[PDB]
Amino acid sequence: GPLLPGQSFGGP
Amino acid sequence: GPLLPGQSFGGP
Amino acid sequence: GPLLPGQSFGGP
Amino acid sequence: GPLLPGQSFGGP
Amino acid sequence: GPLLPGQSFGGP
Amino acid sequence: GPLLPGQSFGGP
Amino acid sequence: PIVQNLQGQMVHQAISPRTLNAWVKVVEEKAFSPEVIPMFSALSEGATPQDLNTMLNTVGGHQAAMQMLKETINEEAAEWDRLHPVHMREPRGSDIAGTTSTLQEQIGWMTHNPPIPVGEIYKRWIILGLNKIVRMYSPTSILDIRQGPKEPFRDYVDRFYKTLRAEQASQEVKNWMTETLLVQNANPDCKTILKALGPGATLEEMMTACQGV
Amino acid sequence: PIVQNLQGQMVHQAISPRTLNAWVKVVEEKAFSPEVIPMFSALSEGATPQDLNTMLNTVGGHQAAMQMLKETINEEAAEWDRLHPVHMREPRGSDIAGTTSTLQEQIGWMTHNPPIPVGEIYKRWIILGLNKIVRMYSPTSILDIRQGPKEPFRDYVDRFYKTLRAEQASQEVKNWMTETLLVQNANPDCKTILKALGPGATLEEMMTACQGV
Amino acid sequence: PIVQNLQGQMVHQAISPRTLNAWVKVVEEKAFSPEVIPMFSALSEGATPQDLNTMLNTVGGHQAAMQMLKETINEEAAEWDRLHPVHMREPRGSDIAGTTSTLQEQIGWMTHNPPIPVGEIYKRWIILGLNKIVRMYSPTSILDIRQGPKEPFRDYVDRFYKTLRAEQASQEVKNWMTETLLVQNANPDCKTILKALGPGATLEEMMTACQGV
Amino acid sequence: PIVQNLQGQMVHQAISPRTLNAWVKVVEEKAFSPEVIPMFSALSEGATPQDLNTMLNTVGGHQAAMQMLKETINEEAAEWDRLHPVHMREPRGSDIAGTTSTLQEQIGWMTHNPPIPVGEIYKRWIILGLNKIVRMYSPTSILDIRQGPKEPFRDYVDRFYKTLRAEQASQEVKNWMTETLLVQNANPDCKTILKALGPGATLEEMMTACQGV
Amino acid sequence: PIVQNLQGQMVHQAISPRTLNAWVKVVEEKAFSPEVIPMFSALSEGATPQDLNTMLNTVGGHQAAMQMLKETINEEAAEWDRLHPVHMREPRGSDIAGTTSTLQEQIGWMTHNPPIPVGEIYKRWIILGLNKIVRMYSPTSILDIRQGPKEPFRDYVDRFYKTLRAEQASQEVKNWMTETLLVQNANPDCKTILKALGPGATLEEMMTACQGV
Amino acid sequence: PIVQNLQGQMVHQAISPRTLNAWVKVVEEKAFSPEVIPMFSALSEGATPQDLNTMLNTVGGHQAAMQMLKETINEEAAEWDRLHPVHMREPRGSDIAGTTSTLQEQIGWMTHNPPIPVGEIYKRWIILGLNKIVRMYSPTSILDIRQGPKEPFRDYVDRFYKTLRAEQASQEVKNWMTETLLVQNANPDCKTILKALGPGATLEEMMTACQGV
């Protein structure tokens, strides 16, 4: 999925 | 008169 | 009617 | 004088 | 000097 | 290094 | 609202966060006291139906009043769809309400020649519903407003006209109310001065005469 | 107000939420102390009649004063319709008040050559009504202002000129008041210094002389 | 958002500090009460996916809710990648979310003819996740809302419609709820008046009838 | 102020509500402490006489000071009408004050080649009157400022230069005051250090030497 | 930032006082809680290195953290000067940091075709240093977060994901942490419900199941 | 500042009331703590000498510091008039200070090709005087900063680098201070950990090692 649990919105 | 007592400024 | 009771203004 | 005592700045 | 002690910055 | 310890960001 | 694009032709621009925060503050503070209608109409100048719907959706609480508003807009929109037949297309009442049109159609109608001013037509329906709400949130009939024996005549004029501004009655009745009820409901001292002036006096004469009476 | 469009020609732009919030705050705080008239006129620069009506409608409370304003605008508008005959058309008094015209007509009149400045004409009538209100909200005649035996002469000058600014009387009377009443109503210590100066002194000389007296 | 450049063609412009401060304040104060969705959608007008991601990243705290939002956007983006096949390119669900595209691609898609409105598609997914959050932060079923024996009928209408606005159920069920539950869950005095009116009354009639009952 | 119109040529634009609110706040808070003159001049950059008059009219209270200002502007305007003979026309002193001209004439004079900068000429007269006011609101002569036996030398420098900034005396006298009075009016401990430095030291040397003395 | 000039070509425009006041407030209030990084990146959109340096210099206090930031930018800039050889010129790491270039060179690089986006490259280094700071200001390992026997499962999800957002570990480890640690560190009542759901449940299912448990 | 006119060529635009209010607030609150210099330089971007003088004149109080600033600008301006011979003209030091030039000359010099950047040259002199002031308002030498036996090592790093930022000494001395004094002035527990790390550690290693020590 595009948004992983710990990850901010929009990724890196 | 253009502005009646209960009426808002500028009328309807 | 265009605006149903639970519905926000402007619909979906 | 251009500015009288009771008068606002700039006159009428 | 351009800025005297009592004088505001930029002079008169 | 470009940013020395006491120095502000961006240097002089 | 709609504003001139880079091409000079009109295009939509978003209702600002400062305008929305102002409207939210207005409805949170002033709770459909009648000045909310002029404040709504001033904040909503040049608004498309999407901008009007955005303002009304941001109202937190007051959900009984907001349902009275939606049933009014339904009644006005049904009257529009009764009034206008079916042949830019002519907007249906649901299109003017922004419920069944894009924003692009609203820009279309508002920039056509002659204009089809769906933003103003819809703002009339919203203001007519806000009127029904304001008259219901008003706690007193104009028949209930009287001056106390110890009450200054200016604080009675202020209570009277602030109530009169929220009456349903026609302007012929409001005229009659200002003339007859303003004299009759004053306390007997002030009413004596107002009867000594008579029916013909202006509100300035009545207030300056009853000053400190 | 009116501003240059994308086509460079003038078109209306909405009175901002910050200007309306400023005006609402002004009237809520300052309650027709005389600075409300300069504040109104500064906030209302370049205003169309629709912008002026929008400012006056947002006034919450004060409904006795706002009725004194409407009856003044009626009197001014009737005088205009007495003054101007009937032949853009020439605006009737009800058109200048924004009661019987579109905003498009107001842009028309304000952008015509020569201009027909309905925004300024109407702002004159509003300011003339705000004057009548300010003089009525002023609680003291200039004849009532006197210096206390223990009161600093600057706090008496401040009370005197703040009252004088709200007097109805002609500028010939205000001139005579500044000369004669400023000397006569001072307390006997300060008045002795002002009589030792005489009629010819400036307000700076009178204040610096009575400093700490 | 996107706005006209010096060349008149559309280009991105940064989401302002005032808009971000407004959104941060909205989520800090109002904690997914349902008005947060209209406020989000009003603050986020014309937003690119980078602007939407910027708004959602500035949310401090609420990290359980923000994970419910990310798993929703994953579900919506997976549904998009199931719906749309593989052949500007067509954006993948991860591109609409702004996770696998530049901002330049988002300007490209949003300014293409016909537009590929990745800012609105993504704002739909975000609003659908904010809905799931708002319904979970709502503490009461609409079946739980009843009027107290000593509670005004307007404060029950306000509680009822504020709860109804956060129900999951279809509009057919919300219609049935407004008609049947609004009558049935009123206290026996008010419910007696509402049964004397019957099923056909408007919300204005029901409130004005139960006024002070 | 004046700004470029749609036609690129200069035209008037209204003094903003934020600038007027800032000026009102400045005069309400700071009550002709000398920084009011730089604040006035910064807030009034590019102001026409109508903008200057608008700022001065919004001053609430302080009506003794505002009369000292009007009599100064009368004196400056009479000096201008003594200085300039009678032949855009050349502006009379009453025209520079904005009392006997339209705003259109003020735009004319300010945009002519060479300019006739009525906005700056009038701002000089206003600032010269604000000076007379500030020196009168200053409660102490520079001869009165002395250091206490228990007072830090920096709090005496701050009191001294804050008083010196409001002295009437010529810059030759202010120079002599900084050299001689700064040494002489210090308390005997600090004055001993300043006499050990002598007349030649900079203000940095005098403060760093008397630090903690 | 950079914006279109009068000639349409891009030129620098100053970072506004409202943006700087917002950033100063952000760092004064939120003290490198992780939302400071999205807030920095949103406030710093389109920033040149001079704008980035201006934001970081206005940080009052926190000087231990700001030294950790400068030593990070040194490490990133040294890595850049290791990565890029020596042949607009190609910017050295000290040029990207704005330490050894004019602002004109930064406009040059940012407006070249293809762009050399020194504003984004440097913002990556700053954000990577702010990350190291945020993980050090975070007081608890994700291994330390457990639910109390009397603690609501939503307040544990909020503490867990707010801690997880500040973990250093790779996204494979954060995935494993959300699945395994979210089940294992719940209190035995809630953990019993989460073990009855199993490993496959979404965060919505886990929260709605443990609601009031 | 200077900005593009209607003709696209550069012309002056007034320093805004929000920028002046921000600067006044900065100096009123932060009283020449070192962040005042970055705040001054950020608020004063693109400033002409008239804009710089306007900022410095609005400083209320602090008149001892403002005299240390004027004597510095005199020293810098005299050095400029020693450095530059006499042949737009070349600006004298008094012209760069804005004391002996019009604003039109400052626009001339700042828009010439190559530019004569009197706004930046003068801002360097002002910042060099603000430096002398900040180092004098700093109450402690870097030699005085030590860690207490009960004081966290991060609160000592914060005190140390906040003091080091206000030291006069050359960057070679500040480098030596960060290496040697940071180890030596720590309390014996933390200093033992820092001696176990040695001279080579980064500030991150030293802080993470002494965490909770």
Side-chain angles (χ1 to χ4, degrees), chain E:
Chain E
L3 299 179
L4 300 180
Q7 192 182 49
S8 54
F9 294 87

Side-chain angles (χ1 to χ4, degrees), chain I residues 1-2 6 8 12-85 88 91-149 151-213:
Chain I
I2 292 178
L6 181 62
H12 177 269
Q13 68 178 10
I15 187 162
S16 75
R18 180 152 41 83
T19 294
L20 293 184
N21 186 50
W23 172 244
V24 169
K25 185 180 293 183
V26 163
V27 181
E28 285 275 35
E29 287 184 347
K30 301 184 171 76
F32 311 114
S33 184
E35 68 271 33
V36 172
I37 292 158
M39 289 168 184
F40 178 73
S41 193
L43 290 165
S44 191
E45 285 191 328
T48 61
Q50 179 161 314
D51 303 312
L52 289 159
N53 292 330
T54 301
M55 290 179 74
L56 299 179
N57 287 331
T58 61
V59 177
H62 299 295
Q63 292 299 335
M66 301 294 92
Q67 177 57 15
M68 293 168 58
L69 187 49
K70 290 184 302 200
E71 75 180 31
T72 300
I73 291 157
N74 287 338
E75 181 165 35
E76 302 318 317
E79 172 56 21
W80 181 273
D81 280 327
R82 189 202 65 73
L83 187 152
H84 281 50
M88 293 297 293
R92 305 321 313 175
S94 63
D95 303 328
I96 295 191
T99 64
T100 52
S101 66
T102 62
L103 179 57
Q104 183 56 225
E105 290 156 86
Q106 297 158 30
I107 298 159
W109 291 312
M110 289 176 70
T111 62
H112 187 254
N113 290 296
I116 297 162
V118 299
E120 173 53 17
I121 299 160
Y122 187 30
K123 179 154 53 73
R124 291 200 297 261
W125 306 349
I126 292 161
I127 285 167
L128 184 51
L130 288 169
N131 270 280
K132 286 180 163 70
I133 291 160
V134 163
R135 294 140 172 61
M136 184 169 295
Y137 272 57
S138 181
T140 54
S141 177
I142 194 64
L143 301 178
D144 305 329
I145 305 301
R146 301 181 185 85
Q147 187 184 13
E151 182 173 22
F153 188 76
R154 180 162 65 208
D155 291 353
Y156 159 72
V157 176
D158 287 357
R159 286 166 58 230
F160 184 82
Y161 281 90
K162 190 166 189 286
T163 304
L164 191 80
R165 192 181 183 189
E167 277 294 334
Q168 187 272 339
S170 63
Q171 187 55 48
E172 176 71 344
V173 174
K174 287 179 181 173
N175 273 306
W176 174 92
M177 285 177 171
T178 59
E179 298 172 350
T180 65
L181 302 193
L182 193 67
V183 176
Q184 176 64 310
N185 282 12
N187 78 23
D189 187 23
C190 302
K191 176 158 51 185
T192 300
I193 303 303
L194 300 184
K195 282 296 189 186
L197 290 170
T202 61
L203 175 69
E204 181 174 33
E205 288 163 300
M206 300 171 79
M207 289 184 77
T208 187
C210 299
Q211 190 164 238
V213 170

Side-chain angles (χ1 to χ4, degrees), chain L residues 143-149 151-158:
Chain L
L143 301 178
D144 305 329
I145 305 301
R146 301 181 185 85
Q147 187 184 13
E151 182 173 22
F153 188 76
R154 180 162 65 208
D155 291 353
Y156 159 72
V157 176
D158 287 357

Side-chain angles (χ1 to χ4, degrees), chain J residues 64-85 88 91-102:
Chain J
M66 301 294 92
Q67 177 57 15
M68 293 168 58
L69 187 49
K70 290 184 302 200
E71 75 180 31
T72 300
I73 291 157
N74 287 338
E75 181 165 35
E76 302 318 317
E79 172 56 21
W80 181 273
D81 280 327
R82 189 202 65 73
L83 187 152
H84 281 50
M88 293 297 293
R92 305 321 313 175
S94 63
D95 303 328
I96 295 191
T99 64
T100 52
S101 66
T102 62

